[PDB]
């Protein structure tokens, strides 16, 4: 396949199949594909450029042209809004295993899905499949190794040095808070209650709080300052030397530094913009399994081919690929 090169260039502004932060900004600042003032060739070229940046960028042009189908598949409802037929231009890529994994959210990218497949972490209804080009048929159950999914969807595991520096900063801030609370508990209580009033109940802390005494400041205890130079290279030492109310007996992000993700598992940053539940898969996240129900179809007012581009862009790309760019 193509070698990944400048997939997240801000200047180019192409949107990729990826939960990347730079990809998120590229999607955000995009707006729409500008087709005005352009000849028909320029329109088709712009459409092809953007849409192939999203749909199946890792495929070579000639391979994609071979696997491209003029046929577009739709369902008629026998029991009104216009069916967007030409959003199916790239539906054929959706039966590929590497795209199915990404739509199931078992990988952060189609590229990561390819790697998960190639490294033996994926199965299709029992049998290990190591080929991303594998195409699923309706009813096929596929699964991913849960650690791979948890790493794709989780936050990056920090290294020892980085986590240790972060924890040094944690200690400094905790001690500063303890000093401020001890000296002037009046204003600290006032600020705490005022902030509790300001915040929304969406935070769990507000619900727990709904669920003055000078003794409070007596409970707050300073935390000894750590210097990492002497503590460097010894993880068992720093683990026992860190004791804070939130993180207890482990260095930051490494509660169990033998798993491949931020160990107290929290979702990866900027996950919600790309959290989309597909219509053609059923996903069980406890088991990291999914079922491929059907090939994506277009129905009145909807297309199950997830894409960030409007119908005109896919129309122009389809016109491009009908004639091989003639």
């Amino acid at each position: 396949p193509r070698k990944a090169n400048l997939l997240k260039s801000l200047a180019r502004g192409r949107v990729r199949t990826s939960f990347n932060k730079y990809n998120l900004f590229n999607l955000y600042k995009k707006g729409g594909v500008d087709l005005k003032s352009k000849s028909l060739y320029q329109q088709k070229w712009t459409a092809k450029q953007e849409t192939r940046a999203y749909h199946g960028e890792h495929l070579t042009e000639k391979r994609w042209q071979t696997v491209f189908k003029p046929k577009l598949d739709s369902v008629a409802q026998l029991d009104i809004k216009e069916t967007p037929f030409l959003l199916q231009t790239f539906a054929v890529l959706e039966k590929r295993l590497d795209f199915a994994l990404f739509r199931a959210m078992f990988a952060s990218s189609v590229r990561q899905a390819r790697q998960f497949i190639l490294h033996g972490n994926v199965r299709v209804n029992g049998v290990k499949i190591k080929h991303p080009s594998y195409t699923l048929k309706p009813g096929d159950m596929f699964s991913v190794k849960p650690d791979k999914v948890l790493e794709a969807l989780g936050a990056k595991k920090p290294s020892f040095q980085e986590a240790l520096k972060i924890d040094k900063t944690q200690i400094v801030l905790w001690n500063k808070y303890v000093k401020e609370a001890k000296t002037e508990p009046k204003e600290v209580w006032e600020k705490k209650l005022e902030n509790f009033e300001k915040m929304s109940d969406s935070n769990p802390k507000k619900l727990q709080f709904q669920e003055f005494d000078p003794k409070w400041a007596k409970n707050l205890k300073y935390h000894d300052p750590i210097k990492l130079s002497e503590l460097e290279g010894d993880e068992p030492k720093a683990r026992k030397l860190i004791n804070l109310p939130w993180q207890k007996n482990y260095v930051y992000g490494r509660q169990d530094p033998k798993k491949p993700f931020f160990t107290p598992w929290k979702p990866r940053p900027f996950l919600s913009p790309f959290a989309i539940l597909p219509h053609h898969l059923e996903i069980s996240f406890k088991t990291c399994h999914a079922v491929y129900l059907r090939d994506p179809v277009a129905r009145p007012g909807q297309s199950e081919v997830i894409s960030p581009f409007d119908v005109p862009v896919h129309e122009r790309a389809y016109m491009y690929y009908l004639r091989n760019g003639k």
Partner: protein, 305 residues
């Protein structure tokens, strides 16, 4: 007419002015920094609206057009923020009126430029268990479960299989703590499928559109003749569209061979007919051609058909 167009944001942002000779900066980088806000000592962007996942079954999809590209919020109070002239983040001078009355359809629209892409509805574990029990224990046919809960039949069968896999995994204590936290945070991100609502329940009368019908054909007939779906089906030489839904809701002689001790394989002979069985002579060779047939073995190995 067409030139290269650096993908600057479509919304206003403060561009670079005079720059120190050694800054070596781009306006795109500043636009991204303003979109992201300050980065913590922990490598986090607490001030960005989209940094953290939702928790109330209301997806937090991007809205760069409604909010004028202002993505910053106070993480605790969730109130909008803006970058003042002096480089601080404070309340907007004026409040946005496009961010409060957002059409309910827009809240399920992942991408601002594609109105036709909408997120699906997650099924609650209670509903999934109900469907599993109905199908497996009470033996209710998938058609009536589909009708009762407003779910397409392949989705019902997929739910049954996935719940069976979940039951096995739970019986083996294979669902770790991380898996449960991931599942429940993902489950609280998406809207919950509601069986009772009419507009949230899947349409159950969909049939594939075959090539035969797609061509428009017209018949000129006497002004008063009735012409119904059955007559139309007869004209197009197809089954009527209702039997398609009805049928979608729902010998060869063989000889196994004698195995003896020490023989590593058995022979099964399937009866065939001369003129239909065999590899044909002078068949098209596609191995050097762009459409060469690739298949997969029962062990998942890529093979050449």
């Amino acid at each position: 007419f067409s030139r290269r167009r650096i993908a600057y944001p479509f919304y206003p942002f403060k561009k670079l002015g005079r720059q120190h000779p050694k800054k070596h900066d781009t306006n795109l980088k500043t636009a991204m920094r303003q979109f992201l806000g300050p980065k913590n000592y922990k490598g986090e962007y607490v001030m960005n609206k989209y940094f953290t996942v939702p928790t109330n079954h209301v997806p937090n999809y991007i809205k760069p057009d409604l909010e004028r590209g202002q993505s910053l919020e106070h993480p605790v109070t969730k109130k909008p923020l803006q970058l003042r002239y002096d480089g601080t983040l404070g309340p907007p001078p004026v409040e946005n009126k496009r961010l409060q009355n957002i059409f309910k359809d827009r809240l399920l629209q992942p991408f601002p430029s594609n109105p036709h892409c909408k997120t699906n509805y997650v099924l609650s574990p209670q509903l999934k268990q109900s469907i599993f029990e109905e199908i497996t224990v009470e033996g209710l046919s998938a058609q009536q479960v589909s009708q009762k809960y407003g779910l397409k039949i392949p989705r019902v069968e997929a739910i049954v299989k996935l719940v069976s896999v979940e039951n096995s995994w739970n019986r083996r204590n294979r669902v770790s703590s991380d898996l449960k936290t991931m599942d429940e945070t993902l489950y609280r991100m998406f809207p919950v499928f509601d069986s009772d609502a009419s507009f949230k329940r899947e349409n159950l009368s969909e049939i594939p559109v075959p090539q035969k019908t797609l061509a428009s054909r017209f018949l000129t007939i006497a002004e008063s003749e009735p012409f119904g779906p059955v007559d139309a089906a007869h004209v197009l030489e197809l089954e009527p569209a209702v039997e398609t839904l009805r049928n979608l809701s729902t010998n060869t002689k063989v000889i196994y061979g004698e195995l003896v001790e020490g023989e590593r394989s058995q022979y099964k002979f399937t009866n065939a007919k001369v003129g239909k069985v065999g590899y044909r002579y002078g068949s098209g060779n596609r191995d050097n051609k762009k459409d060469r047939r690739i298949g997969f073995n029962k062990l998942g190995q890529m093979v050449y058909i």
